[PDB]
Structure 1
Amino acid sequence: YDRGVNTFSPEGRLFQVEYAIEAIKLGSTAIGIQTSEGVCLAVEKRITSPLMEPSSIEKIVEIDAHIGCAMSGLIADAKTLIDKARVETQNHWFTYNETMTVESVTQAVSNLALQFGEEDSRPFGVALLFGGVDEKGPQLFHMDPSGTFVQCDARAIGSASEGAQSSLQEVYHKSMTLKEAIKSSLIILKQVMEEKLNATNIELATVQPGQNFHMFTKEELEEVIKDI
């Protein structure tokens, strides 16, 4: 019964949004943690074969100078939201001569998280993680296909979400520092990955008021893993 793509459920909810949520579950995992000093962030590239070059894969693209990002699920759906969210930040800066706050970015995306239909096709299949430092401090955010945008202090996504959250409330408190959190992520990653953790599997991303920028180079990660 291929019905009427914008139709509610008997529960009810949007059928196709509820189907879209299950598309996050087969995507790769990620870890965000809000620090009082900044925002650290983690992901796994999921190398498929030694054929592939490992460093061309992007899971973190950096939206402005001061607003990081993390994508998930289908990447080619995510790239459109990345490129247009950058345009919305620049339009904010060229009407206003100030940095667009980290909050209003996700309103400016989630107002078109739901545009599917026939007149006026399918909803997006991505679950983004926005970081960044505005004047309100280091903020860590999270948006879904439904557009239901909420602040999350330390959010996991994807396939590992249940065990990563469930294991992650045990090891988190209010006064986390940065280099504590950075090695506090890779423990969870080496628990949840299937390939051996090394210099080609994961990538970190940090953004701070006083440690910037401050992006993500190699051979930092070599020192990061060897501290285990």
Structure 2
Amino acid sequence: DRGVNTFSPEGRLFQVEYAIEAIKLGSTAIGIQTSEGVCLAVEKRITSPLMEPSSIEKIVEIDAHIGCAMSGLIADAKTLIDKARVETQNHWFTYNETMTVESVTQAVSNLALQFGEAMSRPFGVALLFGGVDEKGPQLFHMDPSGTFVQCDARAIGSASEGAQSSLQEVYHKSMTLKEAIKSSLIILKQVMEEKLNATNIELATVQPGQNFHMFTKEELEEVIKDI
């Protein structure tokens, strides 16, 4: 038996490795960034027809211009989402302006390694932040180890490898938001086990000049009609 804060012989913390292992059991989320906006698409795992699909929410609104998609252990993401919302409101209260996506990501990521023997173990949830600020549309990725990066197209979850492989050929810098939505839906259809039917998926976009928006049913069938 060993403590929570022991290094491995090749210089890695065991608990972070185990949490990263736990990440790979969640549903697949895919985010794409274009000069017209950012799009987030996530899978739903309906285990029974007696469940209500609308009670599963995996894309939340951090703020009117920032949205988040999560995977891994879902119950742990609530604390991070609450902290992010509180920090954005505090920033607005003090400075009378909107926080940027990078600052929100830093504020959330500073909580990752604050555990010991207060938290007793790492979080084991992976997040994608999509936002629009003075620099334009931006997509950020943050993982349980406390490291965050900026991306052009990212896929997290159990089928991340094949999804990233497909995104490598699909993506180009001149994509339109509509093409991005189509490509993300095609990749999601490829990686899922069930059939994509406008009920077991969730999709959202953030565009300049308008707030965070969640696609309803009718738009979902309209877009899926082409696929």
Above 0.5 in TM-score? Answer: yes
* Bigger shift: residues 40-49 or 209-218: 209-218
Task: Return the offset for 1:120.
Answer: 9.2
Mapped to 2, the partners of 1:27 and 1:38 lie a distance apart of 26
- Classify 1:177/1:88 alpha carbon distance in 2 versus 1 (closer, same or farther; 3 Å): same
- Corresponding position: 1:33 with 2:29: no
Structure 2: give runs of 5+ residues left out of the alignment: none
Classify 1:31/1:4 alpha carbon distance in 2 versus 1 (closer, same or farther; 3 Å). same
SS of 1:72's equivalent? strand
Question: How far apart are residue 115 of structure 1 and its match?
Answer: 0.8
**1:109 aligned counterpart, secondary structure:** helix
Is the deviation greater in 115-124 or in 167-176?
115-124
The Cα offsets for residues 189-220 of structure 1, whole Å up to 9 and x where unpaired, read as 11111111102110110001134353332211
Cα pair 1:116 1:122 within 8 Å, conserved: yes
Residues 118/225 of structure 1: CA separation in 2 closer, same or farther (3 Å cut)? same
Superposed CA RMSD in Å reads 1.2
- 2: CA distance, partners of 1:213 / 1:81: 19
Deviation readout 1:33-58 (Å, 9 max, x if unpaired): 00110001110011111110011101
- How far the C-alpha of 1:5 sits from its partner, in A, is 1.1
Q: Contact between 1:63 and 1:86, CA under 8 Å: does it hold in 2? A: yes
Flag the 1:194–1:119 CA change in 2: closer, same or farther, 3 A.
closer
Structure with greater strand percent: 2
Q: Give the Cα separation in 2 of the matches to 1:8 and 1:214.
A: 44
Distance 1:214 1:42 in 2: 12
CA shift in 2, pair 1:119/1:93, >3 Å: closer
Residue 67 of structure 1 contacts residue 133 of structure 1 at CA under 8 Å; is this kept in 2?
Answer: yes
Deviation at 1:7, TM superposition (A): 0.5
String of CA shifts for 1:62-96, please: whole Å, max 9, x gaps.
11000011011111100110011100000000000
In structure 1, runs of 5+ residues without a counterpart are none
Contact 1:34 / 1:153 at 8 angstroms: preserved in 2?
yes
What secondary structure does 1:51 align onto? coil
Distance 2:131 2:92 in 1: 16
Within 2, Cα distance between the matches of 1:120 and 1:165?
Answer: 33
Check the 8 A contact 1:207/1:215 in 2, yes or no: no
Distance verdict in 2 for CA 1:120–1:81, change over 3 Å: closer
Say whether the 8 Å CA contact 2:37–2:206 is kept in structure 1: yes
Task: State the TM-score, normalized to the length of structure 2.
Answer: 0.97
| CA distance in structure 2 between the aligned counterparts of 1:165 and 1:121, rounded to whole angstroms | 33
The answer as to whether partners of 1:61 and 1:68 remain within 8 angstroms in 2 is yes
Contact 2:67 2:212 in 1 (8 A): no
Q: SS of 2:61's equivalent?
A: coil
SS in 2 for 1:132: strand
Deviation at 1:112, TM superposition (A): 1.0
Is the contact between residue 113 and residue 122 of structure 2 (CA under 8 Å) also seen in structure 1?
yes
Contact kept, 8 Å, 2:66 with 2:212, in 1: the verdict is no
Aligned length: 227
Partner Cα distance (1:213, 1:196) in 2: 27
Change (3 A) 1:170 1:121: same
